[model samples]
Target: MTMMDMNFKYCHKIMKKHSKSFSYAFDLLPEDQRKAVWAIYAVCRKIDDSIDVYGDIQFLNQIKEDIQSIEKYPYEYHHFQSDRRIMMALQHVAQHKNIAFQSFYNLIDTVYKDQHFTMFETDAELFGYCYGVAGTVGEVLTPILSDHETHQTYDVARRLGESLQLINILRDVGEDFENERIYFSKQRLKQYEVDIAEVYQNGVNNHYIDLWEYYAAIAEKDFRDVMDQIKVFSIEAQPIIELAARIAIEILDEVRQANYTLHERVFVEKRKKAKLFHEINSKY
Candidate 1:
């Protein structure tokens, strides 16, 4: 619970290395809030790593069960046995922030559901999964930020979650296709006369450009909306929201410049990241 704890420090160090941008934003937070955010990030990273590295349905199912049990009991022994990193980190966040266990459970449930469910048939289904996996993190973090008094803060948090999810989709399109999973809406692809087969074989084609543009536009709009919401927050919270929006917008721009090529590796350089961090910190 205390920031001085070695475990908390380890968690902070790990998350900082894994997600430098987020860690920079987190460093701007008050100590208690920083610790809480680190805890949430640790938990999320653990679940995400388990899914990505293990790829074991049984393990994912067990995570789903553990999440459900946590929701049901909240304060009791949930019989969830994860590595110490996740357990301690999540327990600290949940206990300190009073995060709704159900929302956390919803996230795990969606991931498990996706293990079998390959493609989303509709935009609504896609949003549902995004909400469950990413949006829930926003809802969970809102209280930890202690900015719930202003609805705008929560709104920005929600949009940030969606923005992050959109970036993830854009980043993983190729891998998704390789794994027989598709997050892009079928309707949109059809509108461009593009089929899943072509997408799989060609990765990114001229027909898919407009579709990628459309999605990126949506994400950019949401990022702007999130900034609008961020303006209403206190100075402390503003930096976190602002930096997050900045990084997301930059990533979207990278995707755009790559001509929406799913096979192309698109990412901001470390120098750019450090510069952004300086700009944000210097209030430029």
Candidate 2:
């Protein structure tokens, strides 16, 4: 089947609009790779928005089936008309980059799985979800950047993605739980004898801090390990992952400075990201 010609300027505009937090790391890419990543990002946000904004499980699962079809039969898998040009562009980018379709399909499956009422019973379960949702993005993008040579570097990049997702889970404890989206490991909650009902009602206490501190340490370790993997990529490509690691580290540092408080919002600011990206970009 002939691959249709694709345009990403449409994808580029939405990426700049919705992906503000991620743009610092994403912007470090060269033009072609940036477009590839934007195409994937737009599709991901579209799938996520269907579930998050409209609560349309059927709509999302339908998209999931479309991704499955695109995996092997792109010629026959147009999900919509020109309205979904973003996903059409992704189809072209996926073929051009030889991006593994299973990695792309895994994200749809995970997001569909996420729409269900899932409560974590163990750290492993949470990490599995984290890998499926966030780590898959790293695996998807790593091939585009790193030339698919070293397996170890890709593993580190996936962990880097999970590290950031874990941080987000920590940050969204009460807020997510409010919408039946609690991600706390039941094992940890049981070990600490912390009643989650009380947590939702009264915010976090010492026990809650201990739980997040454990997860926080894990995030820090992955970030540290990923930093060491940067030497594997080309110098130009190194900053892309480097910027991600820096942003993740800054977030962990934010939690540290807050003295483990969970009541207040904690995130890296736009200026800090701008300065951070500028410093990293100067060498290239």
Candidate 3:
């Protein structure tokens, strides 16, 4: 088999195995752009997998090496396929799209920083962390959505990314607590009187509900902002962006339905997603 094809299969597998949050949105893209999405997700998933509570300095250095190689290497050719399977596939995608370097470095930096992170000191810290992990995805995606480019496209996308990331954090708060990692801001937790002990031990309470609502409100506003700029995207891609935002919004809404009891994974039911699609179709 040709190197590019083989490496893409590998990257696709990597992405499918790990990309629980974005697979639906990723599937909406035209094949050409979706390949790049899968490629980026594979690379990010690899970096994310390498560092967690059990991860260590050796893994951190290795993560650094892998990302540095991608950043420094010339990927426009078909050479190192087997050695760096995901990166080589990503290289092929990068050849076609203007992969944002800031996004790349920001993602790598977040992966590196996660090794020691347990909590954030402030809302700004949490926002910055989300920017690295989630906002960069939108920045990288903006160029893929339209190489033509515009002013607020990436900015809106960045906000959407942060919003989606916040949803992820809120949805998986209990799960994250199990991992001994907390992505919520200490400032908000303190202001709301949310005890860390209650995070995992106590099931759910008014404080927890209020705490999640605080962040969800921020995410809800970000989605509204995403709608204001949805017109900037190409006609074909506008629905894709809208569907992504809608699904993420439903996730937060699901939390409300559950009354903020989020120990289980929350999601918009399939019927709801289809209904949401038809609901958004009229707007586009």
Question: Which candidate gets the maximum TM-score versus the true structure?
Answer: 3
Computed on alpha carbons, the lDDT of every model, listed in order, comes to 0.71, 0.74, 0.75
Instruction: Show model 2 residue runs off by greater than 4 Å.
Output: 1-19, 73-83, 259-264, 282-284
What are the runs in model 3 whose C-alpha is more than 4 Å off? 1-3, 57-83, 282-284
Evaluate residue 118 in candidate 3 and report its C-alpha lDDT on the 0 to 100 scale: 60
Best by lDDT: 3
Estimate candidate 3's alpha-carbon lDDT, on a 0 to 1 scale: 0.75
The model with the greater lDDT, 1 or 3, is: 3
Instruction: Residues 41-111, candidate 3: write the lDDT tens digits.
Output: 77766666666534565654554555555556746343432237786777777667677766877787787
Structural similarity to truth (TM-score) of each candidate: 0.83, 0.85, 0.88
What is the TM-score of candidate 2?
0.85
Superpose all Cα atoms of candidate 1 onto the true structure and report the RMSD in Å to 1 decimal: 3.3
* Per-residue lDDT over 1-284 for candidate 2, one digit per residue giving the tens place of the 0 to 100 score: 22333458777777777655566677668988888888877776677667776667766766666666567676655765323577677777766776666776787778887777578799888899898878887777776767645788678768877887887777666556666777878888899877766876776688877877888888888788888877766566788778877887787777768764545667789899988888977876
lDDT of 1 by residue, 134-185 (tens): 8877877877765555666666676688788887787667666776777888
- How many steric overlaps are in each model, in order? 0, 0, 0
- Model 3 weakest lDDT span, ten residues long: 74-83
Ranked by lDDT, the better of candidates 2 and 3 is 3
